[PDB]
Amino acid sequence: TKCTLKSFTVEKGIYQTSNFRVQPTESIVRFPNITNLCPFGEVFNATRFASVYAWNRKRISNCVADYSVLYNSASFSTFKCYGVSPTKLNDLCFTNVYADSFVIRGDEVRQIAPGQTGKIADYNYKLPDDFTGCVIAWNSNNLDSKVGGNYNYLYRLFRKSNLKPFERDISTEIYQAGSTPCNGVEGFNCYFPLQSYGFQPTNGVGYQPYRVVVLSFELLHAPATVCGPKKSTNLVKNKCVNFNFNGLTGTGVLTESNKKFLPFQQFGRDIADTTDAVRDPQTLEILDITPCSFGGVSVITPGTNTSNQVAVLYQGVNCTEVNVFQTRAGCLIGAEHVNNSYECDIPIGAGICASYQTSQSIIA
C-alpha cells in the first residue's frame, strides 16, 4: 500500500493495491471416438497379386491410419525400415503413401532393398535411395501350395532399359543378343521377355510364396491427408484448468449443467458472443464453462499512526479459491464478525463496514 501510494504514512480508508488472478494448474485434451479407420486390412490378406512387374498401386486419402497393428503382429517375417522409426509413426503425418505389392520368393527378399540392388534394380520394381518406408514381406506358404506350380506372376527379366523409381517394367521386346531382330518366337538369338514361376510346395524352402507389400512415404506441400490417431486425457471438474477440446481452446472451469443441446449442436455461446458451454467429445454430456476467479485486492487500514496491522479484501472472490468471513463483496481475511452494530467508519460494500475497536483488532 505504501509502495502504491508513494508515501510512508497513510490514513484510514480502503485503498486499491493490486489485481490477483488464479492460474490454470493442469491441461485436459479431449478427442472423440477414433472412427474412420483406414482400410489397411485388405492390403495384406486379399485376392492374389496381378504380377511382379504389373504391381498394383493403392493411394491413400483422408483416414485414420493406425500403426499399432503392423509392428505388433507375428505373421510377418521382415520389418526392416530405412529411417522410419516405427515407435514414432503415431506422431507423424504424411501425405503420400505407396502401397506397392507383388509376389516374390524367399531368396528375392534380399534383392529388394535400397542397400542391395541387382536382379530387382533394372528388371522389376526398383527402390529409391532415400525410400522413407518399411518393407513388409511375410511367408505366404499357408495355402499357396497348389499342384502343378501355376506360373502366372511372370516377372520380366533381361531387360535393357533400367527401371525408374516407383515404376513398372512393362515392355514387350524380345531379348536381342546383338544380332538382327527376329520379330518372331525365339528366332535368331531371341528370347521372349518372360520368366517361369512354379515354386511348388515340393520344390524348396527358398522357392516359396513370399508376397511382399512394399510401403513407403513422401512429403509434399499439400496438407496432411493420412495420419495416425491422437491421444486423450481424463476429464476433470471443479478446477481452473486449460481445456483443449477438438475445436475450442481456452481456460476456465468445467462443471456440470442442466442445458440440453440439439443433436447437431456442439458449441455454446452467450449474448456477448463468448464461449460459455461445450459438449464432451467422447461421451454425451454438456459441460458448462465459467471463467476463473479474478479481481483486485484492497486493504482496510486504520491509519499507520494508531496501529500497523491491516486486512485484505479479495473483491468478488469466494473464500474457497483463496479470520475468514464471506461477505457480499468478497472475503475479508483478517477481521472478526461482531454482531453489535455501530456507525460506519470504513466502507467495504453492501452495508458491511470495518473499524479498529476492542485486545484491539479489526472488526467487521
Epitope: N72, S73, A74, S77, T78, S85, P86, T87, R110, N139
Partner: antibody
Framework: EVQLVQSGGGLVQPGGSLRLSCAAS????????MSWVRQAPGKGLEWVAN????????YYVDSVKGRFTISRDNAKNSLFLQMNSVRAEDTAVYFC????????????WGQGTLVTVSS | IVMTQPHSVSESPGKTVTISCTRS????????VQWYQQRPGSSPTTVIY?????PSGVPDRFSGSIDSSSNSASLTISGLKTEDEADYYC???????????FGGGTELTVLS
Amino acid sequence: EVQLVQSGGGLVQPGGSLRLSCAASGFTFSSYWMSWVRQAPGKGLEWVANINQDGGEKYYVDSVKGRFTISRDNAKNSLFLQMNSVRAEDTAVYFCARVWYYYGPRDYWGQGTLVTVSS
Amino acid sequence: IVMTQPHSVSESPGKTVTISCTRSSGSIASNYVQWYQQRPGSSPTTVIYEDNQRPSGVPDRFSGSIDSSSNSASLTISGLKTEDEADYYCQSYDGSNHNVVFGGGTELTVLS
C-alpha cells in the same frame, strides 16, 4: 518410473516344480508383449518363450516344447510361468522383460531368480 | 542358426575397438540388430537398438553400423574407459518360427 520385481523360488528339485510370477507395475500393462529370457551360469542368453496380449498365442521354443506352461492374466496385471518335470540343463537364472514391439528390443528387464537344481 | 561373436578382447584406454557379430544364414538387412550390456551381478540393459539410430541416456560414443557384405554387424564402442568395462551381447530376430536368437557374449576389458 518402471521398476519390475519377481520372485517365487529359491530351490527346486527334479520332478517337483513351481510357478514364477512377474509382478507388472509402473507402466501400462495392457499394450505390450511379454517374453522370458534365461541366463545360464558362465553362458550367454537364451530365449525361453513368448506370450501374446491376454490369451492370443503362446509361442514356445523347440527345446522346452512340451514341458513348460506360460500364462498371463491381463486383468490383475501379472505374468505367470509354471514349470513341470524340470530337466538337468534347466539350471539357469530367468529374467522378466516386457516387449516394446514384436520387432524391437526389451525396454525394462527384471531382477533375476536363482533357480538351480542340486541333489 | 547361430550368432558368432569373439569370446574376449582387451586393450588400453584410447582408440575404439568394434565388436563383430556374423550371422550364419539369411540376410542381416532384413531385421533390426540390437546390442545389450549385462553388468556382472545385475540385470542387462539396452545400449543401442536399430544401430542406424541410438536412444537417449546412453552417450553418443557408443556407435554401430551394418555390414551387408557377409551378413554381419559391428558395434564401434568409442571412448574406452573404466565405466564401460563390461559384457556385451548380440541379438537379431531371424527365426521364422517365432524364435529370438541371441549372441555369445564378449569380455571387453581394459589395461591397467
